[PDB]
Amino acid sequence: TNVHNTKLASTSAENAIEKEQITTFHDVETPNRIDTPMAQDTSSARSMDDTHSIIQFLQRPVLIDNIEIVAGTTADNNTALSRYVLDRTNPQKYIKQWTLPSTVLKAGGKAQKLANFKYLRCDVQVKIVLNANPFIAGRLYLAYSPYDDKVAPERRIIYTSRAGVTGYPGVELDFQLDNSVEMTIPYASFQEAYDLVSGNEDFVQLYLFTIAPVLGPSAESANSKVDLSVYMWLDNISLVIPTYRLNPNL
């Protein structure tokens, strides 16, 4: 019976059901396996680092945008937040807008790991690292508006006042006080999970407004400016249901 390096053909139990992760094999009899006798782990990968999961991979910060606002510019990035908005041809100006959670699913190789999965529940974590020499001042407001693209215009963070914009959930971002701000955007869908295949829908828009423009010396200079870098990742993740389909958008 006791032979090495081969498994001979034999009968076995007449009703076998082996369940791998999601595939379940039924066989008429128990398969005739050959495994390695007294197996070992002859590698060092488990000693180099820990094996990261998909939840860990999706928790990795990804650089989304790098902005550079210059002082003395009548551009939408430097022009400030307006007291009133009387018409839609004259809305509130913003530095950068982000459709979420798409902007993260389509970044850092996260779509490769979200592939072959149907439903998702996740919070979006945002970190902005700003840098401005001690002679530059200013103040930004990072706020998020849910369903801003799908909600009526009167209900949008765009097309409302400064006191309305700053009534939204956000972080005050001063150049000389808050060199860095963080923000957690919760799971914003009205449905039980994000559909990663059928519905390419976004549910929360992230806006970076300007309370006070870049205040620098009167003398024109290339140095009167600030540089931004926005990082994003996911948190409180749940990928559950497999699927053979993919979103070609991602």
Binding site: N15, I17, I22, V28, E29, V240, I241
Partner: protein, 208 residues
């Protein structure tokens, strides 16, 4: 391998999911507010079988006139759920909401009597327990019919015997229109289960 055609009765449930009872409850506490567990409650609800049933004046009209039509349609619960069963028992409830558009007499009144099923008004007396309403002060009749039967279960089929269970007569001294809603009493239930029929959906008359 043994030459055999057998059944091992293998069952597989997917997805590594939680308890369906708990999740279903969580869902109903957020999107329904109730949990229907049985279909007799639907025999207690009142549903319309005709939203306009016109009648003639001084005419005793057996409601079989209408329920023989309604039972085949499948519009109300007492008809839709009757295609799953063969027997029934218990009494029935009928509500008649007045929708009479014209005034015929100074005093309009609605009156209801008993009648054996499948009888005609010319075969029965206007005696026994009755109920009278005045649509001007009370535009809803709300009569009930008990199970006055020779048998403990009534078949939804035809029979040799006749007049073996009670039904309703409806009298109006004037030509009235009615919303007719019906239901079963607190004892009505259907028999023992059978298969479903086909269902009729949308009809699209297209030019050829």
């Amino acid at each position: 391998i043994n030459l055999s055609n057998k059944t091992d009765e293998n069952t597989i449930s997917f997805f590594d999911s939680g308890d369906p009872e708990r999740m279903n409850n969580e869902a109903l506490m957020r999107g329904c507010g109730e949990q229907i567990v049985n279909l007799r409650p639907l025999l207690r609800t009142f549903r319309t079988i005709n939203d306009n049933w016109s009648l003639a004046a001084n005419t005793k009209t057996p409601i079989t006139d209408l329920t023989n039509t309604a039972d085949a349609e499948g519009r109300d619960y007492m008809s839709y759920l009757s295609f799953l069963y063969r027997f029934y028992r218990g009494g029935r409830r009928y509500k008649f909401f007045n929708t009479t558009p014209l005034k015929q007499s100074q005093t309009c009144y609605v009156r209801s009597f008993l009648i054996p099923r499948n009888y005609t008004a010319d075969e029965i007396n206007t005696d026994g327990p009755s109920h009278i309403t005045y649509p001007v002060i009370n535009p809803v009749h709300e009569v009930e019919v008990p199970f006055y039967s020779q048998y403990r279960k009534i078949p939804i089929a035809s029979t040799s015997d006749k007049g073996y269970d009670s039904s309703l007569m409806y009298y109006t001294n004037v030509g009235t229109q009615q919303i007719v809603a019906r239901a079963g009493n607190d004892d009505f239930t259907f028999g023992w289960m059978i298969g479903t029929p086909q269902l009729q959906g949308i009809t699209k008359e297209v030019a050829n």
